[PDB]
Amino acid sequence: TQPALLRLSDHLLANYKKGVRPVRDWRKPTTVSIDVIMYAILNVDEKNQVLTTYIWYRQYWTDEFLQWTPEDFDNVTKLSIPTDSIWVPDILINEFVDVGKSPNIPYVYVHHRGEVQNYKPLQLVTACSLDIYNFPFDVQNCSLTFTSWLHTIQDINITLWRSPEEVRSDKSIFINQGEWELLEVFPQFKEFSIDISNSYAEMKFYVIIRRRPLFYAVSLLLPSIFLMVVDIVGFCLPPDSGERVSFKITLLLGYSVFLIIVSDTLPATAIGTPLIGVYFVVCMALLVISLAETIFIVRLVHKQDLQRPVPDWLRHLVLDRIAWILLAVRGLLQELSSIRHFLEKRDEMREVARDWLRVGYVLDRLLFRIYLLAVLAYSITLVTLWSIWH
Amino acid sequence: TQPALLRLSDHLLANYKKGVRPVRDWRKPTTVSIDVIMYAILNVDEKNQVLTTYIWYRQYWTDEFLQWTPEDFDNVTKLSIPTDSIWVPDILINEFVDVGKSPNIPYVYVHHRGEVQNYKPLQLVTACSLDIYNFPFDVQNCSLTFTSWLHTIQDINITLWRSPEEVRSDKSIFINQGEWELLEVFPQFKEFSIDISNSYAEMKFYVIIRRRPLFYAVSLLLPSIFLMVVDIVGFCLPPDSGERVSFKITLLLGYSVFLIIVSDTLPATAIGTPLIGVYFVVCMALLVISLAETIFIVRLVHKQDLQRPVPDWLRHLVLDRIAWILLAVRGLLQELSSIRHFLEKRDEMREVARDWLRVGYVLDRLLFRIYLLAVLAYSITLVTLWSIWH
Amino acid sequence: TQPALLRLSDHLLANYKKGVRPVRDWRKPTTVSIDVIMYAILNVDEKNQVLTTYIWYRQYWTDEFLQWTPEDFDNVTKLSIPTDSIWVPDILINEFVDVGKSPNIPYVYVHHRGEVQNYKPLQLVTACSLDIYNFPFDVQNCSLTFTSWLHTIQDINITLWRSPEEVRSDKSIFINQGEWELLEVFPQFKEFSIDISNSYAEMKFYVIIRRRPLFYAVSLLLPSIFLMVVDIVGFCLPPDSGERVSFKITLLLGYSVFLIIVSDTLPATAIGTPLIGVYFVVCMALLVISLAETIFIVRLVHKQDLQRPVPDWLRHLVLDRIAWILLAVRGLLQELSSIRHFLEKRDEMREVARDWLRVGYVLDRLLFRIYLLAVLAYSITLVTLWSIWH
Amino acid sequence: TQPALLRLSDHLLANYKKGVRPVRDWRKPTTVSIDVIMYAILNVDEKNQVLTTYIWYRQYWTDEFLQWTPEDFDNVTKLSIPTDSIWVPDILINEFVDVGKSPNIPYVYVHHRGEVQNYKPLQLVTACSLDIYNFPFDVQNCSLTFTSWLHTIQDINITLWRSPEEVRSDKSIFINQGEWELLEVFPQFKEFSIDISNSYAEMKFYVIIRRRPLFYAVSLLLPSIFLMVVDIVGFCLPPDSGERVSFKITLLLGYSVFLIIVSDTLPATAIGTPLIGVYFVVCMALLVISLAETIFIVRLVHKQDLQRPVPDWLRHLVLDRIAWILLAVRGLLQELSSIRHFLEKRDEMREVARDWLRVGYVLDRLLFRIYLLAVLAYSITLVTLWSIWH
Amino acid sequence: TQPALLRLSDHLLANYKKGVRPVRDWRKPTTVSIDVIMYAILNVDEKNQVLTTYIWYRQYWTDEFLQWTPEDFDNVTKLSIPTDSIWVPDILINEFVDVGKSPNIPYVYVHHRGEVQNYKPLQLVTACSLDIYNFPFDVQNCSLTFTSWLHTIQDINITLWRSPEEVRSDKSIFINQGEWELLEVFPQFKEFSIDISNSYAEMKFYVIIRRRPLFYAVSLLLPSIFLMVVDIVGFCLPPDSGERVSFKITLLLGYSVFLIIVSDTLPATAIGTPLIGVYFVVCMALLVISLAETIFIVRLVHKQDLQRPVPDWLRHLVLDRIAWILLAVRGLLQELSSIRHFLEKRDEMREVARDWLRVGYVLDRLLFRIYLLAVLAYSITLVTLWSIWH
Ligand SMILES: Clc1cccc(Cn2ccc3c(N4CCNCC4)nc4ccccc4c32)c1
Ligand SMILES: Clc1cccc(Cn2ccc3c(N4CCNCC4)nc4ccccc4c32)c1
Ligand SMILES: Clc1cccc(Cn2ccc3c(N4CCNCC4)nc4ccccc4c32)c1
Ligand SMILES: *[C@@H]1O[C@H](CO)[C@@H](O)[C@H](O)[C@H]1NC(C)=O
């Protein structure tokens, strides 16, 4: 007479108590078989160390009160029942630090043997230990522990819907265009107990994710390489030009502002600075060494009245070794003698300055070649370090 | 006696089960016809790759229990019934990453043959693949897949209220003053199944949106063009003025700070930098080439005591080819001879410096003209690339 | 016996159906009279083009089921009834893009003839077309369309509680200390229909708001005027000082950083830059013209060994028209003659440089006067454009 | 037999209507006595002009239906009753612009004579007029108007739980470590009516809060004082050194970037800039005056070939008043005469330059002393303005 | 016949009033035993002075109505009962300033003797007094006061589930990779009463947390040390080079921008600046002292025409003590005499300038050594202050 679904719902949900764990014998637990597949990784925030993810979640447990024989209800084998009308286990995540905003699924599937199937999408904001030591290339290992918050293992136990290898091999629906690439989701069963009897079942889903370094190549290497190139370009200025020191200090100011700006994107954790901070401070040290060498050569070549003739040891060393590696008439006479003496003093000062300038030029050329070799060695070291990672 | 609407509501909603799928025969699914119209695009966030939109959404399905004959109820053909009092399908979007804040519509229309019509606005925060390769002029292709989360295709199926061409041609209520211009909404039906029997109906609305580049013309082209113009202006400074290198390095510092500031607005995805990053680094390379040319010409013209006379080959080459392309009396004699020799040495140094300065000036003019031609060629290349897009 | 209010509530809310539109005859619509007064304008966001406002909103409709005679209930003419216990129309706003957070008013007034009065505060986040073409002085025109989302005009119709002139003249409770000044709220009734029969009642409240420009005078005009003043101040440096070009380029760098910082506060829409962007680029062009003049005068006055005597045409033109507008003894002779020739060459070079320096000084004074006149003309043009707006 | 509390709850809440105002005679209003004490001031946001506060709030009203005699119920005089089970007045705040997130208190106390006591914490986001004219030392006067949103004064009236002096003297639980110091909370009863009969009771709690200026001393005065100090330090550079104008312009650029950075923390309202903006622009004026006077002295002392001897009036004025305030032999003769004439011209130019340099040095010393006195006067004026405030 | 759990739930929750405090004798209070473990410290915000934490919270109280004998219900000793079906105490925290978003646990355990056990996670946003006086090394002392909001001590009283030493020793589940390290959680019972009879039970959990300074070593010491190092590097430039003052002022500008950028990360409270602000301003003062020394030496060594010979006292003092610490023929004669006099004047000026330059060089070396010693003393003082903390 009446529709089969209406009769079945009247048979099931009438005189049914949704606050009772659905077991005829209270000594057996309800085994909630859960399953998790990752849809997207919305945000990994290394400052507060929380991971935002969206997962598709499904679980099923045996409801010993929602059972019927199909033959009495027009051969119906399954029907959808509202989630509010039946008992639902309190499975949530330990690592929660903020309840997510996820849609509510109002219906669940019930089979004729009691297997209630619940599908639900979840937005998860969970705490995790984010090790940024290898920041551009770091691989993170975040856990998602599903468990019953109140019920012990004697009341609610948790298993897997699918074999752990199948869970590990899932990368199907994952949104992959973002910064973070999902490697694997590894499930593992554990019992959490700090008491002899109070044992709580758990299911740890180790979400392992890898950052894509292509986001940061242009943002990190390009400015540093650009400034190191313009350092070599500015090296060509003659030391006595009077513009070299200004050029170098302006370049150092530019590098300083670049560093203090890019530090906003560079994360910081209990480890401190990441590994690439060492490379950044090495580049800054190279620039400082360039500035110091420029100042030294400026000190050498600067013409000033206290300059004494170049010492014999320095003259020999630089200009050979480093070069190889690379009566009224009597009154008239007195006036001319005095004028000649003045001009001779001026010329002697000029020649001493010229000798010092030559020594400074040779040393500047040698130190420029040494600095260029050091920069090339640093660049090839970085290239080989990147190559063995690729 | 009683009002027609009260009697009709008593007839319908009494002994009516809202947890039962409204089919007299459980073998036929409820076909939920779906219609979606985009009202606005609130935010396209390429960093986290989520799309925020507001859509007007309506659906209708046949409720076989909410049926009556009009003649018994004062010829009423339709009435408004609360949403909470009837069965409502769980149609929601797969691409959800955050449940939106949308008003709740409490009433739905029910016709005398069971057609229940539901109208509701929806704020959607959905994941999408945002390709910013053509960032100023990129056109995005975001999908909105409506499906029943729990029910399979044997329970709930999805069709279109209107023909797909009519859905595609809809641009009526779209808020259009914003940054993003809606091109079309293209619906197309898929079955999603990773099981032999568990098939889920789906309806993908491909929301295709195009960015308006007028937001970024002033923010991008204007600073680069302005700095290129001032570079050409500063080219006019004489190479021996002692201010040209400072001008060039200050301009390079200004361009560096401009780049590191504008990089906050430039998005970054798994692709890396957008295509216009190539143009930006080409402009920076042109500035660096200008700086290198300035430093080289300064090296040539800088007067210093180690300068030797201009070599014959360079003198000929530059100053012809490039120019075409463009007794106490004896004691008195000795002192005068010495003074003349000092002045002769000074004059010879001055004349050698003058010859080198002439060579440097000619080369500076030639290289300035070459750089101007290169800048003009780059500008017209950019203009002709923009023209074929417009 | 019993209290009058208890008996009245028992008479009304018993056997009362809150899901039924309250009309004894279903052919007549329920006319919901709408009134809106604005409390404050919380935020106008020209980037996403959404308007956040707080309004005091009230409506009243005739409830044909909540009617009684006062004489039976101790002469009670009105009572407060919970909003959840009676039918409430679904009046909301089309322009919604985000449901606001507003307090829920649990009670409504019911009169003895069925007039149900509903008072409720509303926080509205609505989309609007924000034209920033006159950004400092722009007047915005944002609509608020109240309508029944589901019900057609045959079911729910909308009127005004007060005449449109009274609504237009309301500026009483409006919080006025903020950036935005409310001019008027203009109501207008319209029918929205894209079908022959499905006509929906609407009531558009055109909220017209005006920005207060005093927020931006100090933030916008003051830096530009200050940098223009220091430009004229630094213009006085002698062209041959060797510091004028550095001063000018430092000033241009300061203006560039000021522009790229203030661009964060300057909004951008589909129009592009606002009108004051033209004024800003004009000021930047004036600074660039000053820099170019400085470079030209430096080119003229710069002392270098390739300088030739000032041509007759330029000498006449500038220095008249522009100024008006503003034997061993024979061996002794040879050495003296050679020394005199050296000194004569040096003096000739010095005098040619002096003549060029004089020409450059006169041209610098003339161009300074021209530039000062141009700056004054620009300032008075801006002042007279502001005056006609005031 | 049964527990006293169970019997009392059965006696009270059975056949009790929570939608009815608890009065046996509908002509008497329910007097809701309000009491408010402030716990903390979470955020004062002068941009959007909203005040965020957390208050402890309690109210009590006479419920004429929740009355019993203690002797019948084991001498119980009060019991806790759920909030949802009884009538609760709709007391909320007019100044609301955003409903706060506050915990829900489920229970209220009911006395044997009907006095129902409701305790609840409230987070309040309310609009206020924030006058920032004295930004570092401003005192704010924000109101909190508690009133019934729907009920008129004939239905719900509002009084004070405690005397207004006791409310004014409350500073007990206030969290005081923050930026804002609470002075007093002043209650005042008003009637709000824009109709002859529709009068609404109100209770205005004038929350008066004072900002602690110690937050801003280091952030505001210290950079300005430091830049003034380095201005005086760099003043000592000789005017002809060639570095003074570069120093001054670099300092002005530093002050400009400091101003445009600190403007992010300086608020802006309809008043415009605060009062300390005048002091900041005075500091900018002093720096610009220093720069202009430096340029003037550079103009005086700059050695150039067009210099004429110092005029008698300027020489006398400065260097007295301001200083007090502070045959082949004939052919031989011709060559010697020509050489002497060249050297004499050079010496005359050198001496004229020396005289101009002396005049410039004396004027520079005088203007340095004048500028130092002006800076000291400004500093003591600021100190004496701060002292009368302290 | 029926399942034991169903019969037990029917026995318990039938005719059970969830709004009644569960005591057969109303004179006894319900002692709620509270236990708390900190899971993580999500955010410590010293600006608004709120502490965001996630805690695991459990409580148990005696329910005198949910009591049964196990032998009547198949030896069941405990069962899970929904939280909504039973009376739950209103325990919340005084220090709340924003209700947290925490998951809702629907079930609680009930034992056969009435012990109802409630487990729940809690996100807490609580006010606290954050003293930043020792900012990089500060240890905070935040309190969490759990109490019943409405109920007095005669109705609800609070104890500890575990002994206070056990609570103090808990650091098990705490997420420890973040910036803040948890030291201890110290519980302490207090009574809060501002009335003779209205005493409220309270329980304060003093959460003591310590910041990890390793976050800020690279962000604070590294830039300051780098700029101090480049200050010493630029100290080597000769004072008469003409680049030393530009170098020093550029370095000071770099330090100024570094300070005004790092001030965004440095917090500010009612105390004002933290203690390390003194160290920062001391470093800036050292830089200013270096700049003043450079300017003084530039004043000494600057060659200008008004230089008089070095005074005897200064010559002796510096160059000894500080060095130790570290007829037509008659017409021919007249012209020669005049030329010799000109050259003699020039040479005398040159020699006076040389003497002043020597004095300036010696003083520059002495002051460089003094400044280096001062910098070393400051560095070792900072190191020895850090060592006694470590
Ligand atoms: Cl990608 C994949 C890989 C293996 C197995 C499955 C099975 N499956 C089918 C559908 C479906 C699922 N739905 C969400 C979207 N609407 C239909 C139901 N949520 C799920 C949540 C967790 C685990 C599996 C599933 C799932 C899928
Ligand atoms: Cl723009 C357009 C173009 C063609 C057809 C229609 C039909 N239509 C009429 C009204 C209406 C609609 N409402 C929202 C505003 N209050 C009245 C009901 N929501 C809708 C949501 C999705 C699809 C269609 C509609 C719709 C519209
Ligand atoms: Cl300013 C003004 C101007 C004209 C008419 C009125 C009448 N009026 C009186 C009170 C009141 C009103 N309430 C909110 C505050 N608690 C009492 C009720 N909300 C309203 C919402 C919309 C329109 C009118 C009103 C209104 C006022
Ligand atoms: C209903 O409509 C029919 C026509 O279909 C008409 O004959 C009949 O009179 C109508 N009844 C009422 C009550 O309007």
Coordinates of C-alpha atoms in Angstrom, one line a residue, chain B residues 116-344:
Chain B
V116 CA 9.3 21.9 -5.8
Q117 CA 11.2 25.0 -6.9
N118 CA 14.1 26.3 -4.7
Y119 CA 15.7 29.7 -5.1
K120 CA 18.8 30.6 -3.2
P121 CA 21.9 32.9 -3.5
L122 CA 25.3 31.3 -2.9
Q123 CA 28.7 32.6 -2.1
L124 CA 31.2 30.2 -3.4
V125 CA 34.9 29.9 -2.3
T126 CA 36.1 27.2 -4.7
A127 CA 39.5 26.0 -5.7
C128 CA 40.7 26.5 -9.3
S129 CA 43.8 26.3 -11.5
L130 CA 44.8 30.0 -12.0
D131 CA 47.4 30.2 -14.8
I132 CA 49.1 33.6 -14.5
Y133 CA 51.5 33.0 -17.4
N134 CA 49.8 36.0 -19.2
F135 CA 49.1 37.9 -15.9
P136 CA 48.1 41.3 -17.4
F137 CA 46.0 39.7 -20.0
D138 CA 45.3 36.2 -18.7
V139 CA 41.9 34.5 -19.2
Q140 CA 41.0 32.0 -16.4
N141 CA 38.9 28.8 -16.7
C142 CA 37.4 27.9 -13.4
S143 CA 34.9 25.0 -12.9
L144 CA 31.9 24.7 -10.6
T145 CA 30.8 21.1 -10.3
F146 CA 27.4 20.7 -8.7
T147 CA 26.6 17.1 -7.5
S148 CA 24.9 15.2 -4.7
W149 CA 27.6 14.4 -2.1
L150 CA 26.1 11.2 -0.8
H151 CA 23.5 10.0 -3.3
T152 CA 24.6 8.0 -6.4
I153 CA 23.1 8.4 -9.9
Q154 CA 20.5 5.7 -9.0
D155 CA 19.1 8.1 -6.3
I156 CA 19.7 11.7 -7.5
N157 CA 20.4 12.8 -11.0
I158 CA 21.2 16.3 -12.3
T159 CA 20.0 18.1 -15.4
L160 CA 19.7 21.7 -16.6
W161 CA 16.7 24.0 -16.1
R162 CA 17.6 25.8 -19.3
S163 CA 19.4 24.8 -22.5
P164 CA 23.2 25.1 -22.3
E165 CA 23.2 27.8 -25.0
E166 CA 20.9 30.0 -22.8
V167 CA 23.2 29.4 -19.8
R168 CA 26.2 30.3 -21.9
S169 CA 24.6 33.5 -23.2
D170 CA 23.8 34.8 -19.7
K171 CA 25.6 38.1 -18.8
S172 CA 22.5 40.0 -17.5
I173 CA 22.9 40.7 -13.8
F174 CA 26.7 40.3 -13.7
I175 CA 28.3 43.1 -11.7
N176 CA 30.8 44.3 -14.4
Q177 CA 32.7 47.3 -12.9
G178 CA 35.3 45.1 -11.2
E179 CA 38.6 43.8 -12.3
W180 CA 37.4 40.5 -13.8
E181 CA 35.1 40.3 -16.8
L182 CA 32.9 37.2 -17.1
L183 CA 33.0 35.7 -20.6
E184 CA 30.7 32.7 -20.5
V185 CA 29.3 30.0 -18.1
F186 CA 29.4 26.7 -20.0
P187 CA 27.5 23.7 -18.4
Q188 CA 28.3 20.1 -19.3
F189 CA 27.3 16.8 -17.8
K190 CA 29.7 14.2 -16.4
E191 CA 29.4 10.9 -14.5
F192 CA 32.0 10.6 -11.7
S193 CA 32.7 7.0 -10.8
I194 CA 35.7 5.1 -9.4
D195 CA 33.5 2.0 -8.9
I196 CA 31.5 -0.3 -11.2
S197 CA 28.2 0.6 -9.5
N198 CA 28.9 3.8 -7.5
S199 CA 28.3 6.4 -10.2
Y200 CA 27.7 10.1 -9.2
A201 CA 26.0 12.6 -11.4
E202 CA 27.8 15.9 -11.9
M203 CA 27.2 19.2 -13.7
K204 CA 30.4 21.3 -14.4
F205 CA 29.8 25.0 -15.0
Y206 CA 33.0 26.2 -16.6
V207 CA 33.2 29.8 -15.4
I208 CA 35.6 31.6 -17.8
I209 CA 36.7 35.0 -16.7
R210 CA 39.1 37.5 -18.2
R211 CA 41.2 40.1 -16.3
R212 CA 41.0 43.8 -17.3
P213 CA 44.6 44.9 -18.0
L214 CA 43.7 48.6 -17.6
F215 CA 44.3 48.2 -13.8
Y216 CA 48.0 47.6 -14.4
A217 CA 49.0 49.8 -17.3
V218 CA 49.8 52.8 -15.0
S219 CA 51.2 50.6 -12.3
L220 CA 53.6 48.7 -14.6
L221 CA 54.5 50.5 -17.9
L222 CA 54.6 54.0 -16.5
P223 CA 57.4 53.6 -13.9
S224 CA 59.5 51.6 -16.4
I225 CA 59.0 54.1 -19.2
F226 CA 59.7 57.0 -16.8
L227 CA 63.0 55.4 -15.6
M228 CA 64.0 54.6 -19.2
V229 CA 63.4 58.2 -20.1
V230 CA 65.5 59.5 -17.3
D231 CA 68.2 57.1 -18.2
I232 CA 68.4 58.7 -21.7
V233 CA 68.3 62.1 -20.1
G234 CA 71.2 61.2 -17.8
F235 CA 73.1 59.9 -20.8
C236 CA 73.7 63.5 -21.8
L237 CA 76.0 64.2 -18.9
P238 CA 79.7 64.4 -20.0
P239 CA 81.6 61.3 -19.1
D240 CA 84.3 63.2 -17.3
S241 CA 81.8 65.3 -15.2
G242 CA 82.2 63.0 -12.3
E243 CA 78.4 62.7 -11.8
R244 CA 77.4 60.3 -14.5
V245 CA 78.3 57.1 -12.6
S246 CA 76.5 58.4 -9.5
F247 CA 73.5 59.2 -11.6
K248 CA 73.5 55.8 -13.2
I249 CA 73.9 53.9 -9.9
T250 CA 71.2 56.0 -8.2
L251 CA 68.9 55.2 -11.1
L252 CA 69.7 51.5 -10.8
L253 CA 68.9 51.6 -7.1
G254 CA 65.6 53.3 -7.9
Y255 CA 64.7 50.6 -10.4
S256 CA 65.7 47.9 -7.9
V257 CA 63.4 49.3 -5.2
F258 CA 60.6 49.7 -7.8
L259 CA 61.0 46.0 -8.8
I260 CA 61.1 44.7 -5.2
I261 CA 58.0 46.8 -4.4
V262 CA 56.0 45.9 -7.5
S263 CA 56.8 42.2 -6.9
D264 CA 54.2 42.3 -4.1
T265 CA 51.4 42.8 -6.7
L266 CA 52.9 40.4 -9.2
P267 CA 51.5 36.9 -8.5
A268 CA 53.5 33.7 -8.4
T269 CA 52.3 30.1 -9.2
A270 CA 53.9 26.8 -10.0
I271 CA 54.7 28.3 -13.4
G272 CA 57.0 30.8 -11.6
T273 CA 57.2 34.3 -12.9
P274 CA 54.7 35.5 -15.5
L275 CA 55.7 36.3 -19.0
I276 CA 56.2 40.0 -18.3
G277 CA 58.9 39.1 -15.9
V278 CA 61.0 38.6 -19.0
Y279 CA 60.3 42.1 -20.1
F280 CA 61.1 43.5 -16.7
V281 CA 64.5 41.7 -16.6
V282 CA 65.1 42.9 -20.1
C283 CA 64.6 46.5 -19.1
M284 CA 66.9 45.9 -16.1
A285 CA 69.5 44.4 -18.4
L286 CA 69.3 47.5 -20.6
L287 CA 69.9 49.7 -17.6
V288 CA 72.9 47.5 -16.6
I289 CA 74.2 47.8 -20.1
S290 CA 73.9 51.6 -19.8
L291 CA 75.8 51.5 -16.5
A292 CA 78.5 49.3 -18.1
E293 CA 78.9 51.7 -21.0
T294 CA 79.1 54.6 -18.7
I295 CA 81.8 52.9 -16.6
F296 CA 83.8 52.0 -19.7
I297 CA 83.7 55.5 -21.1
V298 CA 84.7 56.8 -17.7
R299 CA 87.6 54.4 -17.8
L300 CA 88.7 55.8 -21.1
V301 CA 88.4 59.5 -20.3
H302 CA 89.6 59.5 -16.7
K303 CA 92.7 61.6 -16.6
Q304 CA 95.5 59.9 -14.6
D305 CA 99.3 60.0 -14.6
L306 CA 99.8 56.5 -16.0
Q307 CA 98.1 57.4 -19.3
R308 CA 100.1 56.6 -22.4
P309 CA 99.5 58.2 -25.9
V310 CA 96.6 56.9 -27.8
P311 CA 97.7 53.9 -30.0
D312 CA 97.7 54.4 -33.7
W313 CA 95.2 51.7 -34.5
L314 CA 92.6 53.0 -32.0
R315 CA 93.2 56.6 -33.0
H316 CA 92.7 55.8 -36.7
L317 CA 89.7 53.6 -36.1
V318 CA 87.8 55.9 -33.8
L319 CA 88.7 59.3 -35.1
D320 CA 88.2 58.5 -38.7
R321 CA 85.8 55.6 -39.1
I322 CA 83.4 56.4 -36.2
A323 CA 83.6 60.1 -36.9
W324 CA 82.7 59.5 -40.5
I325 CA 79.8 57.3 -39.5
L326 CA 78.6 60.0 -37.1
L327 CA 129.9 82.2 -17.7
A328 CA 126.8 82.9 -15.5
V329 CA 124.7 83.2 -18.7
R330 CA 125.1 79.5 -19.3
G331 CA 123.9 78.9 -15.7
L332 CA 120.9 81.1 -16.6
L333 CA 120.2 78.9 -19.6
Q334 CA 120.2 75.7 -17.6
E335 CA 117.6 76.9 -15.2
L336 CA 115.3 78.1 -18.0
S337 CA 115.8 74.8 -19.8
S338 CA 114.8 72.9 -16.6
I339 CA 111.7 75.0 -16.1
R340 CA 110.8 74.5 -19.8
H341 CA 111.2 70.8 -19.4
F342 CA 108.9 70.7 -16.4
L343 CA 106.2 72.7 -18.3
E344 CA 106.8 70.5 -21.4

